[PDB]
Amino acid sequence: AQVVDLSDAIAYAAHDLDDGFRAGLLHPEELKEVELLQALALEEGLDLLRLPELDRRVLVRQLLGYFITAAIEATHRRVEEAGVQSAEAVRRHPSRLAALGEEAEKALKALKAFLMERFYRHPEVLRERRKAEAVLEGLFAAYTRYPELLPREVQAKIPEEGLERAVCDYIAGMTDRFALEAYRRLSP
Amino acid sequence: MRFSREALLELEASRLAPYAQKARDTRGRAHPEPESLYRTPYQKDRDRILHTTAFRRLEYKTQVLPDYYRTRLTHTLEVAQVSRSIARALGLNEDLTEAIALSHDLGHPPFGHTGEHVLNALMQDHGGFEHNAQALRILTHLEVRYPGFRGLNLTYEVLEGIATHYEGQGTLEAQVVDLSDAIAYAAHDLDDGFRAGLLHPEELKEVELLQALALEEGLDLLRLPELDRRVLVRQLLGYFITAAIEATHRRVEEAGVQSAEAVRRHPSRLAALGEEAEKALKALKAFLMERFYRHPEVLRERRKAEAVLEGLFAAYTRYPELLPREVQAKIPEEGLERAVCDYIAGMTDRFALEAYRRLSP
Amino acid sequence: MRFSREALLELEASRLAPYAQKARDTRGRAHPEPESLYRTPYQKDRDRILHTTAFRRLEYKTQVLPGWAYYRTRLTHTLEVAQVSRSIARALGLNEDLTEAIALSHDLGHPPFGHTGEHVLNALMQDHGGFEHNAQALRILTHLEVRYPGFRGLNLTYEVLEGIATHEAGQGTLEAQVVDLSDAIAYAAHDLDDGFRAGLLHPEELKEVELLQALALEEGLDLLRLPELDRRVLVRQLLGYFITAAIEATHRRVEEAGVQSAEAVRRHPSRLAALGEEAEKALKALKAFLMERFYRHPEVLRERRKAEAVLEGLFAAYTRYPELLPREVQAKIPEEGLERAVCDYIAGMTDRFALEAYRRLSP
Ligand SMILES: [Mg+2]
Ligand SMILES: [Mg+2]
């Protein structure tokens, strides 16, 4: 389970970056803001002025390998040095054992800070977020103020779970398109 | 034959009226730059203005009402034609006149005078918004098209014209442009009002000049057909243009001013339409206000414009992070509100409408 | 003071170069009308051209690719051709009002859908007289536009009509010739600009044409990225280059030729307006480059394919079912014939209206 969460983070970092560049939101010059990003691009002779398709793909794969490797080694270390001999021991251990090691740990942090700042807080990304916020808030207010607007199926769960919970479950279980369309259908 | 700028300047003088502004007497430009080989100072100003982003946007910003409605570019070209006709007749600097006419309306935000109104309201607590000053802001600070300085580095007289049409009275050339704008606005909003089927051929009697012109030419006052409308619009422009030339000539003779300097420092404006024309123009603008601008459909679109400008202003003001990074970057030196005002004001009608749409789910 | 037509005519002469067209030497207008007070013959022509319907549609017809969607517009182009030509004319002591009048009217006869329009229309009219934009402009100004009771057309001066018909050929006035040259100059500078602004041209391609690379390298212009400041500087320098070379080379040809009258230009064995050997080379290089990398760009061509299908669908429908035509146009068939009537109608359309008309024709 501990490995899954570390793999989530590694995955986030690598893919956000890929999607960032593809979407045209991240520029090939900002790689300099992350030592790991720069070291890889430079070590492979990548085109840091214009990160062509082939080069981006090399950058993402090398980044994943760097983290998968660091994760394997560091975790072996911490697991050995802890002496755990069973799954039960890992559970009752005073600390989590899945790790990246010092170097990879800060690299990943510096990478997450750069994605937060440049991709997540990108003007265009912030705009679709505000909109997404509006939809959910619109759905929530609408269904709790007017329960009668809910599908009969969901209305029936209100006695068991309570209005708020029943509505939250309904909104949380929706696909993006259905949520958007549901929101649109509430207005003229 | 190759006419260098030095030759053009000399020729321009002796040729123009004494009260006309000669480019060789220019107060100069804020920043230093070599002189042109062939172009005179105003010629260059005309050139620079033509290549600004704001001039290009005129083509995507309608004059009044955001199909048969003309753009601000068309309006500006009509202003340039009327102004140039009047200036040539009075022996005034035509390049200066044109340069001013191409530039006086650059500072309008998307939508109409409507735009400038709501924009000023928002901002009442942050220095306000006026379209002429926005024009000067654009030409001296907002457009970066030359390394070494912001703006266009235009001659003093062109900037002066945008501000006066700065000192007190401006050059006769500048005064002529404002009067031309009025004449232009009038004849063409009347034309567009009819084309849009908003004004009807029977309301013509509400203004004596229109009724008179139409009766005197045998126009079909019941179904004002295309050819008849065109005849009327033409005579209208003809009437006011003649008035302006004659009345201004009179004022100028009365005044005795023998130089542009004399014109700027004169107790009053000299450009005039004269008692009678001044009267008909007033009546006409009033009629247009009532039957065109305040026509229900027009007011419906006015409503929507107010809503687009107000939505964008509140959005970028309440969440600066929604602004392009390039605009966010100007916030330190300009202030949130002004940087946000400059951004909106620089939009085309469709960009603004689309931007406002994108803010919603 | 009040400068009358008479005063202006007098000033004009004695101020202009010998070989420049003086308005007082005009052959006049077809139909008779009282001579105005204040306005010079060409000045009046400028005023009428500006108010024609075709000039107005220029704001709704685009240059290069079809309107529907930031690509200048035929009006922006014209204004730019007017600026370049007037600039060159003045430097050469040529008639500026004549030059202007011609620049403002020469592109009035283009159909909707930039140049692609003219090629498909001419094709569709192979057996009926064909279609040409210069001839169409003339046809509009002498026949189709009716804004004055008493005659069809604008009753323009011989010299302006002459200009539209001779510019873009040994004949015509230096004014007219200067306009065609300005047209080429303007096209080049602005297509380049739109090419880049539209993300269709790339900074790295500037090296393909020696004049461009020469200008980028000289100003320390940042390539690979060619930011707007840099773009605006490249365009301006380019425009300055050709305008300067047009002036110096045309002055050269006119002197070496020895012509001392507009009539001499009209009759000279070759045209005097020129760029000089090196400039003509650069422009030709720039022309080939733009055609390959911009006009033939796939995004541009997919729109051009669409513009043809629209004009083809309009033409076929109206020619096969004249009853679909507005009654006002059906009324002109007997006097013009089916094909011309349809061709004039389609050619006078704005891009936006042509597309709509096309769409209304199908389920
Ligand atoms: Mg105005
Ligand atoms: Mg052209």
Q: For tokens 């004949």, name the residue.
A: C171
User: Computed from CA positions of residues C350, C351, C352, C355, in that sequence, does the dihedral angle turn out positive or negative?
Assistant: positive
**Are the C-beta atoms of C94 and C16 separated by less than 8 Å?**
yes
The rounded distance, in Å, linking the Cα atoms of C78 and C100 is 10
Angle between helix B349-358 and B296-318 (nearest 10): 60
- What technique was this entry resolved by? X-ray
The rounded distance, in Å, linking the Cα atoms of C338 and C286 is 41
Q: Percent helix, strand and coil across chain C, each rounded to 5?
A: 65, 0, 35
Helix (H, G, I), strand (E, B) or coil at A58: helix
- Contact across the interface for B322 and A127, Cβ inside 8 Å: yes
Neighbouring chains of C at 3+ CB pairs under 8 Å are B
- Contact across the interface for C149 and B234, Cβ inside 8 Å: no
Q: For tokens 């005309």, name the residue.
A: B46
**Amino acid identity, residue B216?**
E
Q: Residue B315 phi/psi, 5° resolution?
A: -60, -55
**Amino acid identity, residue B337?**
E
Residue A129 contacts B where some CB pair is shorter than 8 Å? no
Domain C2-363 is found in CATH 1.10.3210.10: yes
Helix (H, G, I), strand (E, B) or coil at A34: coil
Q: For tokens 């002469």, name the residue.
A: C13
The rounded distance, in Å, linking the Cα atoms of B176 and B88 is 11
Tokens of C326: 């507005």
Q: Reported resolution in A?
A: 2.2
Ligand 2 centroid – CA C283 distance (Å) = 15
* Domain residue ranges in chain B: 2-361
Buried b (16+ CB within 10 A) or exposed e, A20-35: bbeeebbebebbeebe
Q: For tokens 């607007």, name the residue.
A: A149
C183 is in an annotated binding site: yes
Classify residue B106 by its DSSP letter. T
Q: Percent helix, strand and coil across chain B, each rounded to 5?
A: 65, 0, 35
Angle between helix B172-195 and B72-89 (nearest 10): 130
The rounded distance, in Å, linking the Cα atoms of C42 and C26 is 9
The rounded distance, in Å, linking the Cα atoms of C356 and B198 is 23
**Amino acid identity, residue C266?**
R
**Amino acid identity, residue B350?**
R
> What CA–CA distances, in Å, run from C257 to B4, C19, C206?
21, 11, 37
The rounded distance, in Å, linking the Cα atoms of B263 and B260 is 5
The rounded distance, in Å, linking the Cα atoms of A63 and A10 is 9
**Are the C-beta atoms of C103 and C179 separated by less than 8 Å?**
yes
For chain B, positions 241-300, list CB contacts with chain A under 8 A. Answer: none
Beta-carbon contacts of residue C346 (< 8 Å; ≥ 6 apart):
C111, C112, C121, C311, C314, C315, C318, C354
Ligand 1 centroid – CA C179 distance (Å) = 30
Ligand lying closest to the C-alpha of residue C191: 2
| Strand partners of residue B71 | B62
**Are the C-beta atoms of B260 and B172 separated by less than 8 Å?**
yes
User: Computed from CA positions of residues C164, C167, C172, C174, in that sequence, does the dihedral angle turn out positive or negative?
Assistant: positive
Q: Return the CATH number of the domain spanning residue range B2-361.
A: 1.10.3210.10
Classify residue B293 by its DSSP letter. I
- Contact across the interface for B322 and A138, Cβ inside 8 Å: no
Reported as half-sphere exposure (CB side, CA atoms, 13 A), residue B358 has a value of: 16
Strands (E), chain B: none
The rounded distance, in Å, linking the Cα atoms of B330 and A145 is 43
> What CA–CA distances, in Å, run from B170 to B167, C237, C275?
7, 33, 41
Ligand lying closest to the C-alpha of residue B64: 1
C133 is in an annotated binding site: no
Chain B environment of A134 (Cβ under 8 Å): 360-361
How far is B293 from chain A, CA to nearest CA, in Å? Answer: 29
Number of H helices, E strands in chain C: 18, 0
| Strand partners of residue C151 | C148
Tokens of C97: 């009002």
- Residue C163 sits at the vertex; the CA angle it makes with C159 and C164, to the nearest 5 degrees, is 125
| Strand partners of residue B62 | B71
- Contact across the interface for B50 and C254, Cβ inside 8 Å: no
- Contact across the interface for B321 and A121, Cβ inside 8 Å: yes
The rounded distance, in Å, linking the Cα atoms of B116 and A169 is 48
The rounded distance, in Å, linking the Cα atoms of A159 and A122 is 43
Distance from chain centroid for Cα B111: 14
C59 → closest Cβ in B8, B71, B81:
B71
Alpha-carbon Rg for chain C, nearest whole angstrom, is 22
Chain A environment of B324 (Cβ under 8 Å): 123
Q: For tokens 């199909």, name the residue.
A: B67
Ligand lying closest to the C-alpha of residue B188: 1
Ligand 1 centroid – CA B183 distance (Å) = 10
Ligand 1 centroid – CA B174 distance (Å) = 13
- How many other CB atoms sit within 10 Å of the CB of residue C327? 7
Tokens of C296: 């033939």
Classify residue A93 by its DSSP letter. -
**Amino acid identity, residue B41?**
P
**Are the C-beta atoms of B15 and B124 separated by less than 8 Å?**
no
The rounded distance, in Å, linking the Cα atoms of B272 and B269 is 8
Residue C5 contacts B where some CB pair is shorter than 8 Å? no
